[PDB]
Amino acid sequence: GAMGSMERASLIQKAKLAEQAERYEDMAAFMKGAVEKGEELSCEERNLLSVAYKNVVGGQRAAWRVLSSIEQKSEEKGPEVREYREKVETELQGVCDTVLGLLDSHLIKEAGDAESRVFYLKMKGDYYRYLAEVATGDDKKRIIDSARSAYQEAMDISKKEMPPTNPIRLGLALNFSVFHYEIANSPEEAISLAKTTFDEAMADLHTLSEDSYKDSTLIMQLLRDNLTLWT
């Protein structure tokens, strides 16, 4: 890899600079370089990894959505709208595969604490979810089951090892509920999960400091917003 010659600390430093500059492609390349040093990632570093790739794939998804809609709307268009949509799709799949590769080599393997293991399995579920959004048919089924399996393992650990207000646990539940609604054709599961997650978090807010309270209630608000949209 092209980051092989750069110090791990320098890669992390530059990932933070790239974040400040909203240079998310660079940020992701720096964090990929950091992961490929072979050492575990700290909490802050895990967040940098996620922010980088979530923003990269977010841009790709947004573009894919613009093009997909144009495609579906097409007077004979020629092959160009399809071609360009496929170009973006392929690039998106490439980024997902890169992330999935990092998590499989060897972030998940070496993650023993709940905070890291749940985080990485949530990511695994997320990037399979993004692959699922652009997939068709039988390939879609396997991708969807890969997402489900990762989220489910993360859910099982989070329920055992983390309080109901833990932001990682909450963001996992949020995303798994989105998976149910948008990917798995399971709106009732989505709603049930979001509601139970919200209610169990509400009942644990009393334990929290001002700062932790703010972190937890943000994700709770997102659960509630989704519920309002879905009901």
Binding site: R65, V178, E182, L218, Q221, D225, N226, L229
Partner: peptide
């Protein structure tokens, strides 16, 4: 927080409107 909530709502609403 308002911005985060707004951005989330846009993404989620797209799916619903797509159908």
């Amino acid at each position: 927080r308002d911005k985060i909530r707004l951005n989330n709502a846009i993404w989620r609403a797209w799916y619903i409107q797509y159908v």
